[PDB]
From a paper:
Endo-β-N-acetylgucosaminidases (EC 3.2.1.96) (ENGases) are a class of enzymes that hydrolyze the glycosidic bond - GlcNAc β-1,4GlcNAc - present in N-linked sugar chains in glycoproteins and release the N-glycan moiety. Endo-A from Arthrobacter protophormiae is modular in architecture with three distinct domains. Domain 1, with residues 2–350 being identified, is the largest and displays a typical (β/α)8 TIM barrel fold, which has been observed for proteins belonging to family GH18 and GH20 of the glycoside hydrolases. Endo-A catalyses hydrolysis and transglycosylation via a substrate-assisted mechanism, in which the C2 acetamido group mounts a nucleophilic attack at the anomeric carbon resulting in the formation of an oxazoline ion intermediate.
In summary, we have determined the crystal structure of Endo-A, the first representative structure for members of the GH85 family of hydrolases. The overall architecture of the domain 1 is similar to that observed in the structure of Endo-F3. In addition, the structure of Endo-A reveals two smaller domains, primarily made up of β sheets. The secondary structural elements of these two domains are interdigitated. In the structure of ligand-free Endo-A, H2O846 is interacting with Y205 and could fulfill the role of a potential nucleophile. Analysis of the structure of Endo-A reveals that the Y205F mutation probably results in loss of a potential nucleophile, H2O846, which is hydrogen bonded to the hydroxyl oxygen of Y205. In the structures of the free Endo-A and Endo-A bound to Man3GlcNAc-thiazoline, the side chain of W244 is perpendicular to W216 and introduces a steric block at the entrance of the active site. The overall structures of the Endo-A in complex with Man3GlcNAc-thiazoline and Endo-A in complex with GlcNAc-Asn are identical to that of the free protein.
Residue numbers in the entry:
A (entry chain D): 3 to 145, 151 to 175, 178 to 198, 200 to 212, 214 to 228, 233 to 424, 428 to 526, 529 to 540, ...
B (entry chain A): 2 to 288, 290 to 524, 530 to 552, 556 to 586, 588, 595 to 615
Write the structure that this text describes.
């Protein structure tokens, strides 16, 4: 592979970095803005609306060699629990590869679709792993590299930086405090998170907000990630209040890298029973789920166990378990707050790629820019003996569907918390396969009502073996949909096996793109559209893009937010 | 990017001048795993009969060309594991574009042979619509003054050198006359005369006596001369085309010819729909005894219709065992009762030492003694073990049994036994039909992990008691987080084990999750030479002369890395850029000292 790569810098490389001189820079730009105004659920009675959750995840295993816009690899870190996350930190950086590292565009897009701000990484490594004081001194030069950090974030389109100083005086310490204050003064409406490590004298992790580290939070940073070795956080909460700062800008670190759900934690020291606070929660390396597994299925099973709990139901969490799950303390958030809302249950990778329920490529692929907004609840069912999981065997658009299967001798599955204003012309649409001939009803919940309305669709269409129902919602114009769900009824078979490959609320074709065959060993550039597809006549899908370009008789189409394709621009 | 040895394939004129000693790939294509004799059959299914045989026509490799000789760094590969319901395997391959004479690849011959299943190569004369040429048929049918057929000799030479058990002959090329037909019959008779004992020649029901392609779907007067002609044996068996409703008249005609009706294999085409294939089972298995044997066309549907190893394996279970998921309890009223409904499972666990590590033939990772020695995807079906006779038979609990590719002791897989088991509740899983003589110094060993601290007991059945004996081990060892038990069987010397099982008890947790990575009842450092592999100048081969397989490790900054495995006499390595370590593992998986190669 010789295509564009996600960026990473040593301080002296960054200082002379310019987008216009960097052939990979345009491929590393995100074109999916941060979704504002997420809406929270209320399924878990224990969950509080005070604490936030930061995730420090190695969304790419390595700093270097990361393709800008996806790769032909099924097993990739397709993290799907954005709904329990308030802030994502791209975990990366090393002495051998580069210490300043922005998130890759594919991951920025996925984060942004879910309304989660994502931060780049500034990592001053420990000296035992090749860390150098020089790099720290270079970054702290005063009269430029803070300006450069802010430039990278603006150009690539991410939301700030995580600063992690781990390289082993007071002059340097004070210069760091000035660097951080400078950032605060110069940043846009952006987050700067600092790791609890270097103290006032210049490395002594406090595991709390204390006198030694308080000057790193006039004000100097948006938050602090607290080191792991604590038993109680009340002191940090009290001191934060004394400083006139929210205790919830403090993120009490938990190291889950090695053991994940088997990590021992003193939860009561962070979440006192029948009590508020003490602080927010910082997760170090939840990508445990991915790095400790060999297969997509096991990876996804572990993420469920980690974020939801052993119950497998976000509404019925067990707070006395060794791992109650993140759903036990944190409301799920949803970016399904705008019409049109459209999902195809795309997990961000596949063993195959489908268009209208037909395989258009048999190759493995990942492109997290194509990951949809996935269900708020994993999983809430009523009735029957059924399991809900993602399937990479069947897909309507992309590489995955939602599978709902098992025994059914009435059953419902509640999928989405939403905030969708209904107007005339708005319709509900959904597309599924059924192996035992059972129909699949849609469910929708209206604001001011606590029960879902389950109905059969009005108009049925058959698309390559898939059934697509349409349900006009003109009768509820002026109302707001607050939930989405499905329902089914058992037949003589006694079995149910559904694959659902799309779900949408709204209505609607984009113009053929002006595509220019250009040099990188090629680069297509084109300038309402969800993503672009590049077919090859043999038709075979050879590329997808959510940006303004792709590196590869060709046919290029723009798909709208509703997934209506444009006429294909032919190119030779 | 692969520039190493490839599995062979030929057009008739390429075969004609083929010589093993000149072919750089030939030594890589030799199977070094002999056909296991004397399989033992189970009796779990009351309906199953012992008369009918089953032939499988499987595309064990999706393509004819580009098939690496000894495996590849690819997890998703056709790792067929229902050898136990198969009597004969036909390697499905050949095309007008790639080659029409195609032997099975060595990895697939090994796996077949480990399970006591004869495996046949393919000779495919394609329909003219798909590039078929009468010339190819005419070339194969060339005859010396001798009366000999030089290309028949070549078929026998290939089978002998590569070590497989015969040929499937499929004549689908239109435009042949009665003279061609008689020459084909003479070619087939010549094979019967010259073949080694035990070699099998199967003929497709296609070209009739006139030369015309008119599939009969039965044994009839139009095709009988391709099986038997008076007292002349023409072929060992016939694969009957798909369009039949009843086979009684085939059975009757076979008897009139003095041949077993079970040398006739009634074709069922399952390529597109697998378990959803409509079949008139009654027309084959009536009321008494089966009319004929069964021919399954493309059961590799399970692989080719799936995207992932897990769904592939689930489909094979549904296909071969049926919707019950229990070979002992099939549903004969189902549209698909499964193969276990009619066929006894056979086992080759008939010899001490019997050793398995539940290696499915591929993995996402490779382990040695419970530690990952390579994180790369791999397949090498030469390493596929003899897997459980029964998929699956359990008693008690709420457990599921499946293969896991997340955990492994040796190779890329383990047997996962997991779910709910309430405190004090007992559960058993019966795995193997066996025939293992116990003598002094014989022991049972098994290696597992338990995620909720339940112990795993072994089960063994003695001839011919009906109950399994469930006992805890006696000597425990901890190996990289895995527990290995040893149970001496000196107390039962002179007895024969006829089955193997496992058992567990539920604890306070109410949950059980086992991964079992070895089960067993029961070398010198390899002399290694670095040799040129002529077609690839930047490549090498290691050649050496008791041993299950060889493992090739290379030194890294991160510890030893597994870079190759071989069940033959050699291995090809691309781009060797280096210190290598080659060990021989015994049948008991005792490793030799490593031979160091620079
Ligand atoms: Ca595929
Ligand atoms: Ca792996």
């Amino acid at each position: 592979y010789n295509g564009p790569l996600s960026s990473h810098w040593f301080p002296e490389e960054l200082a002379q970095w310019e987008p216009d001189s960097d052939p990979d820079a345009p491929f590393n730009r995100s074109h999916v803005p941060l979704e504002p105004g997420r809406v929270a659920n209320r399924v878990n009675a224990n969950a509080d609306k005070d604490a936030h959750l930061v995730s420090l995840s190695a969304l790419n295993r390595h700093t270097s060699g990361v393709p800008s816009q996806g790769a032909p690899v099924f097993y990739e870190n397709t993290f799907s629990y954005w709904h329990y996350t308030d802030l994502m930190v791209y975990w990366a950086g090393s002495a051998g590869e580069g210490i300043i590292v922005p998130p890759s565009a594919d991951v920025i897009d996925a984060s942004h679709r879910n309304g989660v701000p994502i931060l780049g990484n500034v990592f001053f490594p420990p000296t035992v792993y090749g860390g150098q004081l020089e790099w720290l001194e270079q970054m702290l030069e005063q009269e430029p590299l803070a300006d450069k950090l802010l430039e990278v974030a603006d150009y690539y389109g991410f939301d700030g930086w995580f600063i992690n100083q781990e390289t082993e005086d007071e002059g340097t310490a004070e210069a760091m405090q000035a660097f951080l204050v400078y950032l605060q003064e110069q940043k846009p409406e952006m987050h700067i998170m600092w790791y609890d490590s270097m103290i006032d004298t210049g490395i002594a992790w406090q595991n709390h907000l204390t006198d030694r580290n308080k000057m790193y939070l006039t004000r100097v940073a948006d938050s602090m990630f607290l080191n792991f070795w604590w038993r109680d956080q009340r002191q940090s909460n009290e001191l934060a209040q004394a400083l006139g700062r929210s205790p919830y800008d403090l993120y009490a670190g938990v190291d889950v890298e090695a053991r994940g759900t088997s990590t021992p934690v003193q939860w009561e020291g962070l979440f006192p029973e029948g009590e508020k606070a003490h602080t927010s929660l910082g997760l170090y390396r939840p990508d445990w789920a991915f790095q400790s597994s060999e297969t997509m299925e096991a990876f996804y099973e572990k993420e469920l166990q980690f974020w939801v709990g052993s119950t497998g139901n976000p509404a019925e969490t067990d707070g006395q378990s060794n791992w109650p799950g993140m759903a036990h303390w944190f409301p799920a958030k949803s970016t399904a707050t705008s019409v049109p809302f459209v999902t195809h249950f795309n997990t961000g990778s596949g063993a195959q790629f489908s268009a209208e329920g037909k395989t258009v490529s048999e190759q493995e692929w990942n492109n997290r820019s194509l990951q949809d907004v996935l269900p708020t609840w994993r999983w809430i069912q009523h009735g029957g003996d059924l399991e809900a999981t993602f399937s990479w065997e069947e897909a309507f658009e992309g590489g995955s569907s939602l599978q709902w299967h098992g025994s059914l001798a009435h059953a419902q599955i509640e999928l989405y918390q939403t905030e969708l204003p209904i107007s005339e012309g708005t319709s509900l649409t959904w597309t599924f396969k059924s192996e035992h001939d059972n129909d699949l009803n849609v469910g929708f919940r209206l604001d001011g009502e606590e029960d879902f309305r389950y109905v059969e669709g009005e108009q049925r269409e058959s698309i390559n073996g898939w059934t697509q129902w349409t349900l006009p919602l003109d009768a509820f114009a002026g109302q707001t949909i607050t939930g989405l769900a499905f329902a089914a009824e058992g037949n003589e078979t006694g079995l149910a096996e559904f694959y659902t490959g799309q779900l949408a609320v709204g209505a609607d074709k984009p113009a053929a793109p002006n595509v220019n065959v250009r040099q990188y060993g090629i680069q297509l550039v084109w300038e309402n559209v969800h993503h672009y597809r590049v077919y090859k006549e043999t038709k075979e899908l050879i590329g997808t893009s959510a940006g303004d370009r792709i590196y590869i008789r060709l046919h290029i189409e723009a798909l709208s937010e509703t997934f209506v394709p444009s006429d294909a621009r032919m190119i030779d």
